[PDB]
């Protein structure tokens, strides 16, 4: 209109959510509980010698 140009109003997103990126250390000692559980049950068997004889 005349010399000036008119532009439409811009709609705005109401909310934003922040989810930052985190470094991944990738440690291996955690989630190894099964090995500890296996260590718990060694179960060495010893039979008395001389009771039979």
């Amino acid at each position: 209109c005349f010399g000036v140009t008119f532009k439409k109003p811009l709609v705005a997103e109401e909310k934003t959510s922040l989810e930052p990126q985190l470094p991944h250390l990738q440690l291996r000692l955690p989630h190894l509980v099964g090995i500890i559980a296996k260590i718990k049950g060694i179960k060495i068997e010893v039979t008395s010698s001389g009771e039979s004889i």
Binding site: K7, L10, V11, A12, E13, T16, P20, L22, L25, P30
Partner: protein, 53 residues
């Protein structure tokens, strides 16, 4: 203990960025790391260099 100390690093990483955001907000600026700013480049058509200003 290692399981705890692995998760503590993420807490520290979040703490640094949150402190930076607080400084920017107290400073009457905008932290563009926490905001998208990609939707308004399409609503109003501007170049990549013009969006930096």
């Amino acid at each position: 203990d290692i399981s705890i100390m692995e998760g503590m690093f993420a807490v520290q990483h979040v703490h640094t960025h949150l402190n930076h955001l607080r400084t920017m907000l107290m400073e009457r600026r905008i932290d563009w790391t926490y905001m998208s700013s990609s939707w308004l480049q399409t609503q109003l058509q501007k170049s990549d260099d013009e969006m930096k200003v």
